[PDB]
């Protein structure tokens, strides 16, 4: 069957140019009706960017016309997207897609985008690779009424995404909530909670393990009761 | 541009139930024997998958539980009966003209019993305070429905500057939602106040769910 795959830098700085490649396997690009680039913004809004038709002619979204270009390479069976003067607003997941003739009605055909790539996330930012600051979140100032006690781990000011957060090296998997990172003045901040029985903490040690591959950082914070 | 408006934006349904999602175009998408309206389904971490094209034709492999109908400017996607695997975001998309446009999307979520959030508030750790920063964190975990109002109060007054919230998507196992709210301040600001309150208003109670701590 046909398979599409996007590849390109995952990080670009503002005002620079973003260049992505869509490699097609199992189908030649000269056979498809049109080849498209579509991007999805956080919040899930999909914006069609443009396409290269079989004639090699192209059509672009009017919003992007001044800074976009789509070309193809018949030999390597790839098509490309070039977006100039990117801003942080261009941070999104980029997809390539094939528009093909689908069987319709009584021996008729209808064109539709039927095969999309896996997608590739691109972040546009001028931030520098920065390791996270990991802070232990211990209950206000005690233990508490009945069974469950919630502990936390704050992972503040890192770049770029992502960080991996585990509890007790993975041993604690139930009752864990790791929240999506949010931007706090060009750096990411994320938090994770774990709920355990009152019998295990503080008697047993609970540790949040944080790994930030980009900076090769690995930190383990033991949640210790607050010394008031 | 042809603007597509979907309704509703979110739909909570029980398994086996019928779900109907509408898509309204700003101008007709019919032409010479075809309605150029297609539907896509998107599960988190996956690209959109074509479901229906030309208003009512199912793509190969899509089960008959999905049906599309409509013409002109009004289209609907119906799922009956709804199954667990149907929780996803659905989009209508017009191919009548360039630029091709999509609707904003309708999130199909699973209905479950109301659940009150388990709220926990956390003072800044000493490791952060000794560095000059102060983040106070509040977790509002495992609640349903999704709608919740969170307010931070410092010494009894609402504080909105410095508040960052983060939500999880509906849990696949228990169908609840969770949320994190962080108030970030400098150590100096933090030490000018004593009472810190994380207050949540949710459908499950007529009185706000409140968690606080005093610096001392």
């Amino acid at each position: 069957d046909v398979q599409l795959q996007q590849s390109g830098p995952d990080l670009v700085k503002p005002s620079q140019s973003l260049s992505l490649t869509c490699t097609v396997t199992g189908y030649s690009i000269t056979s498809g009706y049109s080849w498209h680039w579509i991007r999805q913004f956080p919040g899930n809004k999909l914006e069609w960017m443009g396409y290269i038709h079989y004639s090699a002619g192209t059509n672009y979204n009017p919003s992007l016309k001044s800074r976009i270009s789509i070309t193809r390479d018949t030999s390597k069976n790839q098509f490309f997207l070039q977006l100039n003067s990117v801003t942080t607003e261009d941070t999104a997941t980029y997809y390539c897609a094939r528009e093909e003739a689908m069987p319709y009605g009584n021996q008729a055909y209808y064109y539709a985008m039927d095969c999309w790539g896996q997608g590739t996330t691109v972040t546009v930012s001028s931030a520098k690779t920065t390791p996270p600051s990991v802070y232990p979140l211990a209950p206000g100032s005690a233990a508490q009424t009945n069974s469950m006690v919630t502990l936390g781990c704050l992972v503040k000011g890192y770049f770029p995404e992502p960080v991996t957060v585990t509890w007790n090296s993975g041993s604690l998997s139930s009752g864990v909530h790791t929240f999506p990172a949010v931007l706090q003045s060009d750096l990411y901040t994320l938090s994770s909670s774990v709920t355990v029985p009152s019998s295990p903490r503080p008697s047993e040690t609970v540790t949040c393990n944080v790994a930030h591959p980009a900076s090769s950082t690995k930190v383990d914070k033991k949640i210790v009761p607050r010394d008031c | 541009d042809i603007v597509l408006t979907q309704s509703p934006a979110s739909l909570a349904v029980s398994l086996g139930q019928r779900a109907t999602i509408s898509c309204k175009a700003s101008q007709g998408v019919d032409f010479d024997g075809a309605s150029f309206m297609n539907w896509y389904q998107q599960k988190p971490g996956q690209p959109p998958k074509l479901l229906i094209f030309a208003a009512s034709t199912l793509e190969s492999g899509i089960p008959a539980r999905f049906s599309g109908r409509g013409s002109g400017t009004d289209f609907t996607l119906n799922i009956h009966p709804v199954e667990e695997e149907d929780a996803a975001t659905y989009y209508c998309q017009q191919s009548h003209e360039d630029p091709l446009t999509f609707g904003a999307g309708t999130k199909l979520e699973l209905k479950r019993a109301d659940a009150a959030p388990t709220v926990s508030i956390f003072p800044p750790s000493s490791e952060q305070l000794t560095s000059g920063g102060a983040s106070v964190v509040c977790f509002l975990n495992n609640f349903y429905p999704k709608d919740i109002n969170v307010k931070w109060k410092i010494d009894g007054s609402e504080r909105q500057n410095g508040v960052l919230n983060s939500w999880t998507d509906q849990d696949s196992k228990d169908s609840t939602y969770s949320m994190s709210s962080t108030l970030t301040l400098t150590k100096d600001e933090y030490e000018r106040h004593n009472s810190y309150t994380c207050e949540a208003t949710h459908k499950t109670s007529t009185s706000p769910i409140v968690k606080s701590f005093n610096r001392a």
């Binding site: 064109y111 | 998408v29 032409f31």
Partner: peptide
């Protein structure tokens, strides 16, 4: 026959 939107660039 084939169905292409009347507003598609290459109709």
């Amino acid at each position: 026959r084939i169905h292409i939107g009347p507003g598609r660039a290459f109709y």
